[PDB]
């Protein structure tokens, strides 16, 4: 019958896998990209999901949303929600103690409380499912963050219902990660490195008889991939200013370009040791091509690569454990693709080899279509 799907439901991506014919495929978008935006934009004639929406945020800020998962299942009055709103374009709103994001769409002001905005996300993913197998899909198991309450995975759960989907379980991204590389299948100690776009998490789990306990949480809601970016976004203003004698800091528009741009020279350092960026007329008609080598990316995020390290340890002290007693040590997040990243945690354990064979952005995915398969066999 109809197979179900696995759906890792990111802060700042997402991806959805099946597992088909004893193995898991990850899942392509009509772009032909294996993850897809966490964002949602609203114009005066359509509603744009994934990739369409990240690409025209420079031209329409204030009505493209993103970041759903750092409100859902919150209350207005949450600190979290508080201290993250200064931070967005778009506007949050408060109805009776429930934060919701309002926005222009067909010459309307419309509100959606965070749940709707994930679930337009997880309509996407479905479709993108559904365009690979050639039929509807109805059932799926999407993560959640170790950490999220009953009120955060109540909120993803209402979130797949609304998107149609009848959702097998809510599960932790990093057990995903862990049954995506078959280690509950081999006590067993993982340590699950998970750095993404805008969150680093720290996960130390025991595995025993094929039930996880989760030994210890640790990392920063505000450390990520578009960190790493905003270091070089600042790096090219002051480049800028020294060859054309203008500071473009002040326009939304340039500054929202360049970072577009550093993304992509970030990706390419990744695998090459120089990167290319070029845009055009980027600030009063003036085309801005240069380059970056990956020693001076390295250098501009120096400290906050090191600072990956102060987790993992807290995380082995609060799981009473040392380095030698951990088995696994789990890549997650494209983050973790960066060369200067992965020498840093395995120096850290002593020149050990890291669980790395899984694409990084799509090992949850992959762990979540794993379980899939295993619980729809059960109804
Ligand atoms: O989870 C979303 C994160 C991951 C980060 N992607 C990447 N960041 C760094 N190197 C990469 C190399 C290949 C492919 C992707 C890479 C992407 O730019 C974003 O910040
Ligand atoms: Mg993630």
């Known amino acids: 019958k109809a197979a179900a799907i696995g759906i890792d439901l990111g802060t700042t991506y997402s991806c959805v896998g099946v597992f088909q014919h004893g193995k898991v495929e990850i899942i392509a978008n009509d772009q032909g990209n294996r993850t897809t935006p966490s964002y949602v934009a609203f114009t005066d004639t359509e509603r744009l999901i994934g990739d369409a929406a990240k690409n025209q945020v420079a031209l329409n800020p204030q009505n493209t949303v993103f970041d759903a998962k750092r409100l859902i299942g919150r209350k207005f009055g949450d600190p979290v929600v508080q201290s993250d709103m200064k931070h967005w374009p778009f506007q949050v709103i408060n109805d009776g103690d429930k934060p919701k994001v309002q926005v222009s769409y067909k010459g309307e002001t419309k509100a959606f409380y965070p749940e709707e905005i994930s679930?337009?996300?997880?309509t996407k993913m479905k479709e993108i499912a559904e365009a690979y197998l050639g039929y509807p899909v109805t059932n799926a198991v999407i993560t959640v963050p170790a950490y999220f309450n009953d009120s955060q995975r109540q909120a993803t759960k209402?979130?797949?219902?609304?998107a149609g989907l009848n959702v097998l379980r809510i599960i932790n991204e990093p057990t995903a990660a862990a049954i995506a590389y078959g280690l509950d299948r081999t006590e067993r100690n993982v340590l699950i490195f998970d750095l993404g776009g805008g969150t680093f998490d720290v996960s130390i789990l025991t595995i025993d008889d094929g039930i996880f306990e989760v030994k210890a949480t640790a990392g920063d809601t505000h450390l990520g991939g578009e960190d790493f970016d905003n270091r070089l976004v600042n790096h090219f203003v002051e480049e800028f200013k020294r060859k054309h004698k203008k500071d473009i800091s002040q326009n939304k528009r340039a500054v929202r370009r360049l970072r577009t741009a550093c993304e992509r020279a970030k990706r390419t350092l990744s695998s090459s040791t120089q990167?290319?960026?070029?845009?055009?007329?980027?600030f009063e008609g003036i085309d801005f091509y240069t380059s970056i080598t990956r020693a001076r990316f390295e250098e501009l995020c120096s400290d906050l690569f090191r600072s990956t390290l102060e987790p993992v340890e807290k995380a082995l002290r609060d799981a009473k454990l040392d380095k030698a007693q951990i088995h696994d040590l789990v890549l997650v997040?494209?983050?973790t693709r960066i060369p200067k990243v992965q020498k840093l945690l395995q120096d850290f354990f002593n020149g050990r080899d890291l669980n790395k064979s899984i694409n990084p952005d799509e090992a949850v995915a992959y762990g979540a279509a794993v379980q899939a398969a295993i619980?729809?066999?059960?109804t």
Not at 275 to 282: C, G, K, Q, R
Not at 375 to 378: D, E, Q, R, V
């Open 375 to 378: 619980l729809i066999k059960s």
């Open 275 to 282: 990167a290319s960026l070029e845009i055009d007329s980027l």
């Open 119 to 122: 679930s337009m996300v997880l």
């Open 333 to 335: 997040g494209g983050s």
């Open 158 to 162: 209402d979130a797949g219902v609304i």
